[PDB]
Amino acid sequence: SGLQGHIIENPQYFSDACVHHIKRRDIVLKWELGEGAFGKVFLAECHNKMLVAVKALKEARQDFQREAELLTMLQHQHIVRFFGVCTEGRPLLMVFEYMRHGDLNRFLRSHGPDAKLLAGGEDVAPGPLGLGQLLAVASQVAAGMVYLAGLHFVHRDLATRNCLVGQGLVVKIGDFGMSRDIYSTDYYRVGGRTMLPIRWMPPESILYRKFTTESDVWSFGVVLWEIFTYGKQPWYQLSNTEAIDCITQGRELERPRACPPEVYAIMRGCWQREPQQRHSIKDVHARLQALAQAPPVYLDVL
Numbered sequence: 490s491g492l493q494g495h496i497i498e499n500p501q502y503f504s505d506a507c508v509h510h511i512k513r514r515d516i517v518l519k520w521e522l523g524e525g526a527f528g529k530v531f532l533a534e535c536h537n538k539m540l541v542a543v544k545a546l547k548e549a550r551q552d553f554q555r556e557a558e559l560l561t562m563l564q565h566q567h568i569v570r571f572f573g574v575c576t577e578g579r580p581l582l583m584v585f586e587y588m589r590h591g592d593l594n595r596f597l598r599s600h601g602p603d604a605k606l607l608a609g610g611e612d613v614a615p616g617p618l619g620l621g622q623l624l625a626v627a628s629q630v631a632a633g634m635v636y637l638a639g640l641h642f643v644h645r646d647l648a649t650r651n652c653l654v655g656q657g658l659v660v661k662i663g664d665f666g667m668s669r670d671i672y673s674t675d676y677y678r679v680g681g682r683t684m685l686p687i688r689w690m691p692p693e694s695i696l697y698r699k700f701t702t703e704s705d706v707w708s709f710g711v712v713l714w715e716i717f718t719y720g721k722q723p724w725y726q727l728s729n730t731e732a733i734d735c736i737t738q739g740r741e742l743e744r745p746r747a748c749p750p751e752v753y754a755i756m757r758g759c760w761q762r763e764p765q766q767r768h769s770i771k772d773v774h775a776r777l778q779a780l781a782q783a784p785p786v787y788l789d790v791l
């Protein structure tokens with residue numbers, strides 16, 4: 490296909506992995522939550538009891554099957570969970586856990602220093618998110634990425650738009666395939682239809698279309714910057730081509746105001762020009778999680 494972030498750009502190793510099929514009588518559509526080029530998302534009830542987000546197919550069918558066979562492989566606390574397919578009737582559905590707070594980018598922006606309401610609530614204290622919470626968000630996204638690297642998957646569109654936030658402030662990697670419709674400003678249109686997330690991409694991905702665990706690490710560095718900026722667009726001062734110009738010359742995003750120097754060093758180790766020089770995601774995870782769980786006395790003074 491060529492679409493960065495599309496799960497089917499990865500290789501299928503287990504061509505016989507089984508896919509769970511859910512009966513029509515076990516699903517009750519409640520209402521629409523959203524809509525893109527390739528589908529509609531609905532809240533539903535799934536029975537044997539629980540709320541689910543279902544993605545309805547628009548139309549493709551072979552892509553659908555390939556997507557379900559790969560998505561049955563992804564089972565991890567920090568990947569949005571895929572429960573199966575409902576193919577008896579229309580629409581064809583893929584069924585996922587429901588993530589109440591929506592996408593992480595919107596969640597950051599709405600709990601940041603420019604938000605309207607910063608009242609305390611179920612999952613968040615009254616101010617903007619504090620350090621320990623920004624660290625816990627980062628850590629969970631990094632943990633999802635350690636899992637993907639363990640299984641030889643490469644995401645290619647890692648960004649806060651492509652993570653979801655659930656109840657209890659649980660952050661998982663996932664999207665319903667509509668980020669180019671909803672956040673089209675984060676993509677650079679080169680083709681008649683190609684849309685590249687160039688502000689999250691390292692030089693080798695931009696120039697050669699090479700994608701590895703290491704270009705994903707670079708993107709994770711950019712995610713870190715988005716978390717510590719409360720969801721700002723990287724290089725927001727710059728047009729797409731200017732950002733390419735920056736990235737290519739080797740300029741680095743600046744330390745955000747809410748980012749301690751220790752955390753900035755982590756970002757920087759993800760942004761080495763040479764892919765083999767970049768930190769390993771297992772080490773980034775390990776450091777961020779250790780920081781998230783550090784004593785408040787230490788974190789208060791970073």
Ligand SMILES: CCOc1nn(-c2ccccc2)c(NC(=O)N[C@@H]2CN(CCOC)C[C@H]2c2ccc(F)c(F)c2)c1C
Pocket residue numbers: 492493494495496497498499527544556568569570583585637642643644645662663664665666667
């Ligand atoms: C032509 C359609 O373009 C796309 N479709 N989808 C897609 C397809 C099926 C289910 C959900 C999204 C996607 N995105 C997509 O595959 N994302 C994967 C689904 N996510 C879980 C469900 O969260 C709701 C995980 C995410 C993902 C994970 C690891 C990867 F390596 C990867 F490439 C994508 C795009 C760009």
Ligand code: NA
Pocket residue numbers: 643644645646694700701703704705706708
């Ligand atoms: Na990548």
